[PDB]
């Protein structure tokens, strides 16, 4: 109950105009929870671009064990034909529990927590299919019908931990297979930071290669700067007044911490995220109160949407950046703060 499904469903909703096909695999969930996710996809206009594969809690452990592979096969159809797809496995920890049941009933000898010996290979065989294939692979698969195009399958597996314990056998295996992880923290979620992403523990192994030019430049070093701010805020909590270098880092980290907060079912485009990142890293938030950062961002976006619509449309074409766009954003933010 800390937003794991909310993060993956919002990521599927954002692809309705991206040209990426979606697959949602529900393993061991109750049928009314599955029906509510489908209603939310339909209300947000994302259902026409999504395949929903269901293996609910009352279904045979064999169907729950096979569902991720069936959904993967439906996603691979697009990858092999020079198209892009996205797949969500809402609970690989429930697939592992279904596999453990079958294996114990077949009388195969148990391991580290009664789990089968090959529980690592269960997930590694599934997750290594999510990949990007070369133009030569697509050209060979389609017998020359598709040329000069790469194909891909992106995966968003979900795992549940017990009281934050990552030392469990299944969580240990999956963290060691993926190209990165997003850790959600219950203490941050209770403290009102609702996307609840722990920036210190979370990491992406592809980094800047997976970003557009504008976001790559405006976000360089933010993750490690927040990781150092969390430590600084705890170290300087009870000490007497420190130097300008310490006050500058602390006051900036507090503003980026309040900025990273977002609501559910409210995605931002490249231009909206770019304005928000630019106003923070270029120092424009230094005069703004922490309790006003959300109101400042919402008003700035609404103002650029009415008075600078042609600039947002230019940033949203490919996420390009240059001195003309940099100066254009600067002039707009200065005029905003000096008049609204």
């Amino acid at each position: 109950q800390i937003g794991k499904t909310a993060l993956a469903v919002d990521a599927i909703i954002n692809q309705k105009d991206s040209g990426i096909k979606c697959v949602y695999v529900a393993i061991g969930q109750k049928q009314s929870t599955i029906a509510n996710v489908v209603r939310k996809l339909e209300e947000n206009g994302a259902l026409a671009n999504t395949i929903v594969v269901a293996a609910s809690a009352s279904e045979s452990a064999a169907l729950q064990y096979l569902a991720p592979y069936s959904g993967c096969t439906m996603g691979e159809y697009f990858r092999d034909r020079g198209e892009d797809a996205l797949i969500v496995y809402d609970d690989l920890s429930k697939q592992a529990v279904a596999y453990r049941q079958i294996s114990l009933l077949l009388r195969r000898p148990p391991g580290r927590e009664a789990y089968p010996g090959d529980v690592f290979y269960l997930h590694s065989r599934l997750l290594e299919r999510a990949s990007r294939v070369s133009e030569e692979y697509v050209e060979k698969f389609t017998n020359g019908a598709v040329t000069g195009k790469t194909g891909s399958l992106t995966a968003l597996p979900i795992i549940e931990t017990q009281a934050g314990d990552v030392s469990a056998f299944v969580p240990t295996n999956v963290i060691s297979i993926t190209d990165g992880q997003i850790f959600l923290e219950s203490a941050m979620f209770n403290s009102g930071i609702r996307p609840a992403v722990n920036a210190g523990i979370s990491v992406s192994r592809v980094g800047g290669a997976a970003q557009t030019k504008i976001i790559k430049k405006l976000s360089g070093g933010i993750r490690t700067a927040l990781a150092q701010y969390r430590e600084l805020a705890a170290f300087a909590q009870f000490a007497s007044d420190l130097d300008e270098a310490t006050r500058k880092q602390l006051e900036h980290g507090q503003r980026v911490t309040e900025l990273m907060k977002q609501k559910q079912y409210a995605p931002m485009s490249i231009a909206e995220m770019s304005l928000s990142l630019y106003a923070a890293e270029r120092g424009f938030l230094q005069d703004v109160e922490i309790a006003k950062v959300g109101s400042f961002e919402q008003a700035l976006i609404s103002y650029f949407q009415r008075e600078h619509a042609a600039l947002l449309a230019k940033i949203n074409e490919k996420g390009d950046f240059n001195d003309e766009i940099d100066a254009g954003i600067k002039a707009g933010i200065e005029k905003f703060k000096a008049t609204q």
């Binding site: 592809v206 980094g207 800047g208 290669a209 360089g220 070093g221 705890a234 170290f235 909590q237 009870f238 000490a239 007497s240 130097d243 270098a245 880092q249």
Partner: protein, 115 residues
């Protein structure tokens, strides 16, 4: 890591760095409950050097440019020894803590402090 295999200057620098970081590990928990001001004049100075040493261990790699954004730095054995001896002897006590974070050799740390 033996004086009979490398040399006494290298070995003393390595053991010197380890001594400073080992003492800091017990003070980290003290500062978090009772604050920095309750430490001795020697402890306050040592903690500042330990936090600087902890940052001067960092270095941007050529294979990590995609993650770090900054360019990669190769540092030599003599350059490494000289940089750590300087922080241990107090030659950089006036530089800010953030100047040693991600900067190859000791010269670049003196330059980062000016930015």
């Amino acid at each position: 890591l033996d004086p009979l295999v490398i040399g006494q200057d290298h070995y003393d620098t390595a053991r010197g760095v380890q001594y400073v970081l080992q003492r800091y590990k017990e003070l980290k928990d003290i500062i978090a409950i009772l604050g920095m001001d309750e430490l001795s004049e020697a402890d306050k100075l040592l903690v500042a050097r330990a936090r600087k040493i902890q940052r001067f261990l960092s270095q941007p790699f050529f294979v990590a440019e995609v993650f770090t954004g900054s360019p990669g730095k190769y540092v030599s054995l003599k350059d490494t020894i000289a940089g750590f001896k300087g922080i241990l002897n107090g030659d950089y006590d006036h530089l800010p803590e953030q100047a040693f974070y991600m900067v190859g050799g000791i010269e670049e740390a003196v330059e980062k402090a000016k930015k």
